[PDB]
From a paper:
Kinesin-1 transports numerous cellular cargoes along microtubules. The kinesin-1 light chain (KLC) mediates cargo binding and regulates kinesin-1 motility. KLC comprises an N-terminal heptad repeat region that oligomerizes with the KHC stalk, an acidic linker region, and a tetratricopeptide repeat ([name]) domain containing six TPRs (TPR1-6) (Gauger and Goldstein, 1993, Verhey et al., 1998, Wong and Rice, 2010, Zhu et al., 2012). The KLC [name] domain (KLCTPR) is unusual in binding to multiple ligands using distinct sites (Hammond et al., 2008, Zhu et al., 2012).
Numbering used by the authors:
A (entry chain A): 191 to 421, 438 to 477
B (entry chain D): 417 to 477
C (entry chain C): 416 to 475
D (entry chain B): 193 to 422, 441 to 477
The structure:
């Protein structure tokens, strides 16, 4: 919910343009004059002043004027809470922006409540099982991963996957991305079998999309290697996400002792 | 007087920074208007070339 | 000559301010002309790509 | 006449100065001048161009001393960079002369106008229609000074160009013959002005109803016949002529002639 109004569009791009060229001496004053032009007409407490302040704070983020950027975003959220009301998407967008600024400075705990309030705002407007609520749960999981809150990471990624897998298709990359992230969280907890099953699920859907339903012949890539451990190969290296899975599960078979299985999986990933 | 001079020097510098930023943007905006007016003259030619081609096709089919 | 210095600073501050406000006025007007042109170039790009497809539709 | 890169800014200045947004126009000009000296240096055709634009905005404001100074500086740059006897130099002299005349400095504007006419003649040719427009303008500067002989010479030269280079039906020709006749009336060259008026009326009549024959006599010739007692041309120049020749007939005692000519003009 970060819609930039028609008027500010050109000036906004010009700001971004100058702030990318590292022409801060031009960008900051353009922002500052635009703010005075906005209060002349609209008054401080306005959605456009809030928009214009958020832009400047991101220019102060680029400069590493982190205290200025934080203050500017607090003022912007304050305007957005009056004008647009609390529990507004613009209010959610600002809290996420403020949490991203805090995480950057390593203030992960400080960024945690902001992220939690925004997810609460997202759930109210979009619905509990909305795909954007899933993107928020994923972001809140990263926040906990950085704090080493292993259990919290698993809960958040588990909630996210619930939304992704049911609301979107199984073939969706967001689903595979979550299952790989959650499996990683499991590996940290020592929930090896849980992560292994997750990897297998990924590989099995990939295989099914390529070569229809799994029957007697046309067994998946993993199932071919696990059978190889007792003694041709058609495997598609379509996605980078599918390689991470192949490499991961391979290493996991090396831990199990199923070395030939780890090998063939490594080879398919190499191919 | 000294306090007043200091404040005027601060304000003069702030004003100068803004004036030069505004001059930079104004120059860039003129060049974008010139690039656009030239590009619209190109497109106006392309549209009136195809408008004549509309009649040329109908004379055959 | 603190008084002489103040007078000069006030003159320069006013000159600067007049120019800043004139530049701001022009910049705003220039943005509106860029917006009117970018919108007008979209109508024309749409019109040209509509007739480019109509070229093939007539030939068929 | 304006260089490529300056074109947009120049229009923007004219637009703001026309809207009467002087507070915008003057500073835009002033900043552009500093941006031009940064790169080019004071003595440059672009600084000269930019200064001429500003002094014309100062004319509109009635900052006449500023406008004069600015134009003197611009002509000074134009003499170095473009050289003396350059059209840009001629344009500036005309500008300074128009500014002087407005203030009533007619004598001061007189040499400037004379130098520009000299430049015009060199580049365009002695009998060019723009040389005629210049001679007319210079003739007007002498009229304001009350230099009757000078006015007659300049309007006589202008008419020579107009009448030969352009057609007889041209309005510039009738305009000059009316202005020159007026100058004659001031000198007391009554018969000369009378003949001039008659010439105007006679060409007008001929364009409308072919060549003058026995039956088809002009408007004046009909009134001169009326004085020995027994038209509706929507041209404003042709009315001035009718009224003026009537005024002459009124002074000549040929009142019926003054009357019919006044009436035709009324119609």
């Amino acid at each position: 919910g970060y819609e930039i109004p028609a008027r500010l569009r050109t000036l906004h791009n010009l700001v971004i343009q100058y702030a990318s060229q590292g022409r801060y001496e031009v960008a900051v004053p353009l922002c500052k004059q635009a703010l005075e032009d906005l209060e002349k007409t609209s008054g401080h407490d306005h959605p456009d002043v809030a928009t214009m302040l958020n832009i400047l704070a991101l220019v102060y983020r680029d400069q590493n004027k982190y205290k200025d950027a934080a203050h500017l975003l607090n003022d912007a959220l304050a305007i957005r809470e009056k004008t647009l009301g609390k529990d507004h998407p613009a209010v959610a967008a600002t809290l996420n922006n403020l949490a991203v600024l805090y995480g950057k400075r390593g203030k992960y705990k400080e960024a945690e409540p902001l992220c939690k309030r925004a997810l609460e705002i997202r759930e109210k407007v979009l619905g509990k099982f909305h795909p954007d609520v899933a993107k928020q749960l994923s972001n809140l999981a990263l926040l906990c991963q950085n704090q080493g809150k292993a259990e919290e990471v698993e809960y958040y990624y588990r909630r996210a996957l619930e939304i992704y897998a049911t609301r979107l298709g199984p073939d969706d990359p967001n689903v595979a991305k979550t299952k790989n992230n959650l499996a990683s969280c499991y590996l940290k907890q020592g929930k090896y079998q849980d992560a292994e099953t997750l990897y297998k699920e990924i590989l099995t859907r990939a295989h099914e999309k390529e070569f229809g339903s799994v029957n007697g012949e046309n067994k998946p890539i993993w199932m071919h290697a696990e059978e190889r451990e007792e003694s041709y190969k058609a495997c598609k290296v379509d996605s980078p996400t599918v390689n991470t899975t192949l490499r991961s599960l391979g290493a996991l078979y090396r831990r199990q002792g199923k070395l030939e299985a780890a090998h063939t999986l490594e080879d398919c990933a190499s191919r | 007087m000294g306090k007043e001079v200091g404040n005027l020097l601060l304000e003069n510098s702030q004003l100068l920074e803004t004036k030069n930023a505004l001059n930079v943007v104004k120059n860039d905006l003129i060049a974008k208007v010139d690039q656009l007016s030239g590009e619209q003259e190109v497109l106006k030619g392309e549209l009136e070339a195809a408008k004549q081609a509309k009649v040329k096709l109908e004379n055959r089919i």
